[model samples]
Target chain A: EMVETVCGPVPVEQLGKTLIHEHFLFGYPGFQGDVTRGTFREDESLRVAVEAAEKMKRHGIQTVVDPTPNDCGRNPAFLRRVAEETGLNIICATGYPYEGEGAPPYFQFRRLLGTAEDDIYDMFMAELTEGIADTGIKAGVIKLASSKGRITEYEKMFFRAAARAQKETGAVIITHTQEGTMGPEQAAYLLEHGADPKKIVIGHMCGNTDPDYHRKTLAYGVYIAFDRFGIQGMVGAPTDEERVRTLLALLRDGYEKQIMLSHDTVNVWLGRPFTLPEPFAEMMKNWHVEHLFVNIIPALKNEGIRDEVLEQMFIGNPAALFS
Target chain B: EMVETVCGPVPVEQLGKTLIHEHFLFGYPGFQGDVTRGTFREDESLRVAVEAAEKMKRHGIQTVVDPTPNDCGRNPAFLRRVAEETGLNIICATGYPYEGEGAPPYFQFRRLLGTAEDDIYDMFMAELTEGIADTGIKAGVIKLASSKGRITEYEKMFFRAAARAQKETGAVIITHTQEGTMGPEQAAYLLEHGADPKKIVIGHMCGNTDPDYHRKTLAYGVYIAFDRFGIQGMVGAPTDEERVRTLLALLRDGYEKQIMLSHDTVNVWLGRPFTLPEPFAEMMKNWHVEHLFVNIIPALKNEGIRDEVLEQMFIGNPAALFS
Candidate 1:
């Protein structure tokens, strides 16, 4: 099966040791206002991102799905440049974030005018089948998100539009669950709207500690991403050791085929730096794209997890999802 | 005193018979996505706006303040072209709308990052003193708005920044009151934040029908706009006759100096047409730039309001506020 990458289409077999979630660069919307404030330097950012990609390549990650949604500063041209320079297959997403954290006023205004759904569907189809805004780079996946505990009507509008696009284009769908809640709801809603469960991934599943939360989502026959590998010591966040315990439980129960792993690291952040509290700040040290390879893999190996199952998470599962 | 217009600066003495609240063109944020759908045509929009501006000029109106904020499709170049072609002094605004119906995700995301207040203040100062993004066209006024019955913290950020810009640059500050609520609160907020009382305008005071509401807002020593004229028969909307009654009461109470009048009409609407219900739709028929001159002023004259009071609302009050 062929999948779209930033450079061009590639066979899913070529996507070896994939990281299903990582961002080469990320700017929350409005980063452009600080362009003159020295918050961003194009050449400097390119150098930093290229360096990050090269390190990931050295760690044997042949592909990365940078599911940075539209309102979250998804840059297709920059992804393509990083792919061209480092020979890493980069897959980008076309969609928007949830209402509580995101939902740009543009689409919100369109929603008020009763034209947001059709326009969003058309935009996704254009980006997947055609190219994003004449950049000639097609997106490989659709991103969707929901608020904490409930999916808002505004966020559901994006879910409906994204399901239409995913059905038409056979694109994979990735979703953001707020604080690890609403995974089952998002999965059920996407499937109810005619999305393929094999091609669907419920992301950030590691944020919750309940085993039922993991199995409840996986029972829907969709992939669950333990993507925030290093996000620990914070409220609503499980430490890496707890995440490993949950991963072992799922793997022991033979759920390896529905599991994907990665660190949702933003290589280069836009705008001024934000300071976190001491405990969260201390835990953020391991929040890098290479954390999965450099740290988490050894930890998993030490717990008697075989390389075969690791290969399933890093290689076989992603290929099956894309296929 | 000289005021900035789209083409250049003009003395307040030359701004005769000004309509302090009208829009040359406005689009809610996502209008650019529908360009291929033929939602907007530049030449046609320019022609239509020019025709409307010429009609106003013929009615002896000299200046029109277009208080379209940043997220609401403010086009400085288009206003400058209209000014050049029609010789109507067009004063544009540089600010953002309220949080409920407006507030783009860019600034909202910046608010999350803790840099929104300073960035907005810098933007206002830049647009007033320098130009809007190197177009060499300076904004003549600052526009701010609050939600129904309350000024949200996010919306208050704009108020705080705008008050700073106005205090520093001597620019006029005009505001939108949701459904006629929060007029006095907005006035007090701006004045408390160090804005000059004479240069502050609390807009859309006509949406409320209570005479006490008018008196309370006028008590703030800021001009209260009887804008949104001819917008009758809608729910929560008073008829033009009732607006005339309110006008006569304010004049009789000798609060004429604190009154300003306009239609708040949008000349060009971007995107698809919205169909309001019958009562609102029929009332929208007279919602045009020329409605104040053609309909409202004559209605006031038949109510025994003399030429001197009409000139004060149309001409003298605006000049005094700008001066």
Candidate 2:
């Protein structure tokens, strides 16, 4: 029997060698405050997503889980297109983003109107059971974000609903953190509400280079993604190299199984409304990824990050996550 | 004739709000691996601190700072007794306990070596120049805690070299929280390093009942003492009520100014080898000191804590921090 979750149905085979987190579409810089800018045309976005998927396929990547939830402009059609084009499994997400001042006034208005519970439950269930856009591509995970370290009431409601959905469906969860401030707190909130720590992946953990943060996250048995690579010069961004070094260090320190790596890479052309510098430009230029696949892997081989360890992150871990 | 950037010998009257972040006559709980525990006698602790009054009494409360560094138990007798006996206004700290297993092996081993530059420059200077020990005692404050939110290598160094000393010197800092997971990315870290947002007090802020962690911290320019407020419950000991209610209500909106409170209330009851509870216990409490003031101040025809706010916390808001 297929299991259901807030994200959607999970096929048993689709669980192998998965990239548990990779944002095929996301641009909720709610700080900009203009609603018009937040909207991205789906057809265009789908095309770009397909191109990204092709790049992943070239690298021998298989399943990609895009945890873009509703408030962050989640588009099921986009996930479907990418999945179809690359012939790679794609899992989408369902949940709420952290409340921002620029968020639609009605973002939390549902709570005031007393329909938040039903609305969230229905939205999560729809993605989980009915399939996104009715296209058979099921959402395989749930997504959530917390502002700072504390979970808001709206977020609590979402967690409750998401937890119920997880209980009902067994789909895993992914969370967007604010500078990795509240990993412990976020974990407590989710676990308290019935979400399993082993089943959750905490993203944006790159913001926390401090060792204590990493150890605490690892202690929880949740996967930590140093996903945003090559953007350290950008305000508050850490470098891909730094992320690599940290991951390697963590692996050495006996957390090899709990770490996953990705780039929340964005390929934005200049002058476009949401254009950013080509993501991972620096890493590609500096030959870090090449080094990663070659030198680092060999170095780890010497240092005891065995094939099994790499396979755990590259294959077994992803498979366990997606499965 | 006084320079703002340079630390100069200024007049007592000109020293608007003096922050003494790290002040220690003696500290116990030293080197667990060593036989130092047997060497810590209360009499010796009292004797060394008893006569050290030159800077404190002369400075008055303009903002008595004291980071008190780490592992040095807050000798309430030394802190309260000294403050009372010498008439030197003191504002003590709440965080900076111990660096546990989470730190790198180098950090654990390096205590025998002298402290590092980051420890002296970043941690010490914060408590010495910026305010830390006094989050809301007399003026706008700074927050201080162990790095990565949990006590570790750099955290221990910071505690000894900076925080404790800063407290003794009468500077103010709040905290950088560990696993309770609240506040901005580096709010706790930055505040410990001299990033002072004059509006809110940021100490152990994650302890509040309000769900919105960052917003609550941001709304008030001072530190929130989310320190050890309720460890009794965690240790299977008795519980306190007032501490919990006061902290919860502080975050319930419209009461930000009156929220400067601490559960720095440690129980030295058993004496020698204090039975410290799990760290999270401090995060879960039922009451705090403000309960009396929060209730009594209102009964005096004062609705909404105006008098308590004015007397205890707000009076110090606009005052120059390190006079």
Measured by TM-score, the strongest candidate is: 1
The reply for model 2, stretches above 4 Å from the true place, is A1-10, A29-47, A101-104, A133-136, A267-304, B1-323
Q: Worst ten-residue run, lDDT, model 1 chain A?
A: A30-39
A35-68 per-residue lDDT for model 2 (tens digits): 1112345577777777777766766677777776
Model 1 Cα shift for residue B64 (angstroms): 2.9
> Can you give the DockQ of every candidate in the order shown?
0.26, 0.01
TM-score of chain A of each: 0.96, 0.81
lDDT tens string, model 1, B1-323?
89989988899999998999998888654444333232466899999899989999988998999998774668889999999999999999887777665535666756655778998898888888888765788889999888889998888989999999887998999888888799989988888899888988998898887889988888879999998897776526778877888888888889877888988887888754455555567777888877887887777788788898888888898898788
Pairs of residues clashing in candidate 1: none
Candidate 1 residue spans exceeding 4 A from truth:
A24-48, A104-116, A232-238, A267-282, B29-52, B104-116, B230-242, B269-281
Best by DockQ: 1
